[PDB]
Amino acid sequence: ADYQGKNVVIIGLGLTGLSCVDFFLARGVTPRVMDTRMTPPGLDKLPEAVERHTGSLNDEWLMAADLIVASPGIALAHPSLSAAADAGIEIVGDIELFCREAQAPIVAITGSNGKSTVTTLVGEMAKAAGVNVGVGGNIGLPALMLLDDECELYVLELSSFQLETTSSLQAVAATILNVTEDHMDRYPFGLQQYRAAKLRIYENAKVCVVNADDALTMPIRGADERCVSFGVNMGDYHLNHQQGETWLRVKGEKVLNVKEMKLSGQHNYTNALAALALADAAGLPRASSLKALTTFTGLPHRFEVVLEHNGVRWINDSKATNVGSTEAALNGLHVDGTLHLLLGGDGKSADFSPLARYLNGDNVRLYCFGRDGAQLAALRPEVAEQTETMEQAMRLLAPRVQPGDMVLLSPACASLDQFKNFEQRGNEFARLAKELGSH
Ligand SMILES: O=C(O)CC[C@@H](NC(=O)c1cccc(CNc2ccc(/C=C3\SC(=O)NC3=O)cc2)c1)C(=O)O
Ligand SMILES: O=S([O-])[O-]
Ligand SMILES: [Cl-]
Ligand SMILES: [Cl-]
Ligand SMILES: [Cl-]
Ligand SMILES: [Cl-]
């Protein structure tokens, strides 16, 4: 694309907004920046040469623009943006800018859960093959910071929001791993509108990889041209259970005994299948992809044991920012004693009801905090306590912890009411676990 001479407005600063500023400056185009926040992240890094407007959107700038680059963190349906759209002004995001320039194939991954594990796993499979790979998007480097002539493959985690502003993605392999209720605060036409944003990922993809166990991951149409599938008991890529052992299979052929993996648990096994299906479709050698599966240890904040001491496991699953992710932590969970489960934050208008089925018996205590702490306590009030903050909840539960217990932060909610991001929430949990979980 050629931006020379265009009046470009970037909405949203932070690292990804900065990447957009830098992208245009390097092409001899000076954009203007606006952000509804008064002191947005990264403001001190914005050169004085770049005009900016903070604390609100500026409709004089937006209606004057030739191109608007919208952060995924701003609603596309914001009345200032719908006005610019109605007037015919082009609106894109950073992923669109990236797709227009990229000179290597792109593997594109979205889903309500699993998407960072699967992105990182395919990145590791590529490295194991000696491929020069750029991994990022919605995690790691903003995609524009990955752009490099020497890159041979890009692996991008994409959110529903990024996909809404992307039109030129033609992925060598794309997947929606699953769709479960999330981001209802941003999708006023509910589950089908959220799904529709994700289904954009398959448009012009060479191979589509779908979840055979989740119908919502399947395009609304495909004909003589089907997607590759992964699943538990069915799929092109699927699991084979043998006594107590599990295998990854591809069309009936065993390819890996999961004992070789460092990741455990069924949903990691289906993540491994999805990653293998994407790697295969991207042309990576099967054997090096399987080697990567054996060496991968998981991400921080993903069901991460931050302390096992004095007979108690303290588990940081702060990456669980929706109900489906906490379900995946609870379903089949083995605890010898009491489970002390921390839930709380901004639930984004989610129905928390699906969690209730995991919370029966005499061996569960709930400690519920943040914006939606009361709604969470209401799942089972007789075993619940509510506090304002996670630290209060930790200090309340710790004296009650006995050998055999588990303390699990798997909060089912965004952290953004009280924290910068779920990493900060996990790091704080870890520090407090280490304080409270030894003498
Ligand atoms: O870390 C957590 O705990 C919660 C993370 C949680 N993330 C989002 O909902 C989300 C959705 C879209 C984008 C992002 C990251 N990028 C952002 C960029 C700009 C903003 C805010 C802006 S831009 C502006 O102009 N005015 C704004 O307020 C917020 C996030 C985060 C979630 O999944 O619940
Ligand atoms: O720039 S981002 O990562 O908010
Ligand atoms: Cl503000
Ligand atoms: Cl084999
Ligand atoms: Cl110990
Ligand atoms: Cl029980």
Side-chain angles (χ1 to χ4, degrees):
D2 194 340
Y3 301 105
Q4 196 177 154
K6 300 291 176 191
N7 292 305
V8 178
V9 167
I10 296 163
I11 304 177
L13 197 54
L15 187 66
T16 297
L18 285 167
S19 78
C20 294
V21 172
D22 289 348
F23 171 93
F24 288 104
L25 290 177
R27 283 159 182 70
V29 172
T30 305
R32 291 198 285 187
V33 170
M34 66 181 65
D35 192 302
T36 70
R37 303 169 285 186
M38 203 75 60
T39 65
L43 186 67
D44 292 353
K45 303 305 205 191
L46 192 70
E48 189 176 27
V50 178
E51 288 179 64
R52 76 301 298 273
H53 173 95
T54 60
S56 58
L57 300 188
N58 182 327
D59 296 314
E60 291 179 359
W61 293 11
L62 286 172
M63 297 297 294
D66 303 312
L67 180 65
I68 294 166
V69 184
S71 173
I74 188 111
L76 202 48
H78 183 299
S80 289
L81 285 181
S82 157
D86 285 352
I89 297 166
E90 191 181 3
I91 296 161
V92 303
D94 77 310
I95 303 304
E96 176 61 17
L97 297 177
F98 176 86
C99 283
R100 294 168 175 197
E101 306 304 325
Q103 295 297 321
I106 298 163
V107 170
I109 296 147
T110 196
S112 298
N113 285 112
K115 74 188 127 146
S116 300
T117 297
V118 175
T119 296
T120 299
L121 274 182
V122 176
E124 299 307 300
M125 295 172 172
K127 290 162 154 70
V131 172
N132 186 311
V133 60
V135 186
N138 200 47
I139 52 176
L141 304 60
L144 294 173
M145 297 181 82
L146 304 172
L147 279 177
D148 168 10
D149 280 354
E150 287 191 283
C151 187
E152 293 164 336
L153 178 63
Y154 293 104
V155 185
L156 298 186
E157 176 177 326
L158 300 185
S159 63
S160 62
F161 307 110
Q162 285 166 316
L163 286 160
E164 290 185 67
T165 58
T166 305
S167 57
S168 299
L169 174 70
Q170 303 194 29
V172 66
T175 186
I176 306 173
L177 299 172
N178 45 72
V179 185
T180 68
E181 188 184 49
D182 199 359
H183 302 297
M184 294 291 100
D185 66 325
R186 288 195 64 186
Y187 286 108
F189 297 79
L191 188 69
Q192 294 310 312
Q193 184 182 38
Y194 173 52
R195 179 189 182 208
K198 293 191 184 299
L199 286 169
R200 296 179 68 82
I201 204 171
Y202 295 137
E203 288 179 33
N204 303 115
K206 186 191 161 280
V207 177
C208 42
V209 173
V210 306
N211 186 340
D213 296 312
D214 180 351
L216 294 196
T217 68
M218 308 168 182
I220 296 179
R221 181 52 62 78
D224 251 53
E225 53 189 358
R226 79 185 178 66
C227 298
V228 173
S229 63
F230 68 93
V232 173
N233 308 309
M234 61 191 83
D236 298 306
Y237 293 75
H238 62 275
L239 307 174
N240 180 215
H241 307 266
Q242 291 294 350
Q243 56 202 33
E245 281 191 295
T246 307
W247 291 82
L248 307 184
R249 293 220 303 194
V250 187
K251 306 183 163 74
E253 182 172 320
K254 286 182 173 66
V255 301
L256 190 68
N257 182 327
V258 302
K259 78 182 178 171
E260 292 302 311
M261 285 179 59
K262 307 288 200 22
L263 297 190
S264 66
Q266 187 179 267
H267 69 288
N268 276 340
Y269 301 151
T270 59
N271 285 341
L273 294 174
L276 191 67
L278 294 162
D280 284 344
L284 298 175
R286 176 65 70 68
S288 36
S289 297
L290 290 171
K291 174 176 199 331
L293 284 177
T294 73
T295 59
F296 183 63
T297 57
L299 297 174
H301 319 284
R302 191 40 87 183
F303 209 82
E304 177 183 9
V305 180
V306 294
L307 176 74
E308 182 160 2
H309 184 68
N310 287 341
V312 176
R313 279 166 313 192
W314 299 74
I315 291 180
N316 170 10
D317 194 41
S318 183
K319 207 356 173 160
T321 54
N322 61 39
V323 166
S325 187
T326 301
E327 274 203 74
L330 301 179
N331 177 54
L333 185 56
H334 171 68
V335 182
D336 290 303
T338 301
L339 174 62
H340 306 270
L341 176 58
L342 293 122
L343 303 170
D346 171 11
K348 297 168 277 179
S349 298
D351 187 352
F352 297 124
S353 298
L355 297 181
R357 75 174 267 220
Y358 298 105
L359 305 177
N360 302 314
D362 300 327
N363 300 302
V364 172
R365 297 292 170 81
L366 310 178
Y367 305 89
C368 298
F369 66 91
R371 188 180 306 236
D372 294 344
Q375 190 167 355
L376 291 158
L379 288 172
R380 191 178 169 197
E382 335 79 67
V383 302
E385 297 240 51
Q386 190 189 345
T387 59
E388 183 71 24
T389 65
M390 185 180 76
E391 175 169 7
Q392 286 165 352
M394 285 284 280
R395 297 189 185 281
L396 184 66
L397 70 89
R400 305 173 180 176
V401 166
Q402 302 297 342
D405 283 8
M406 178 180 285
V407 182
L408 174 57
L409 168 68
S410 186
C413 295
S415 71
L416 300 179
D417 59 313
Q418 296 173 311
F419 303 90
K420 183 168 64 174
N421 47 46
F422 69 88
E423 285 92 346
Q424 185 177 82
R425 172 177 71 189
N427 292 331
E428 194 183 303
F429 169 85
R431 170 180 57 79
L432 292 164
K434 294 182 180 173
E435 175 190 338
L436 299 167
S438 50
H439 307 293

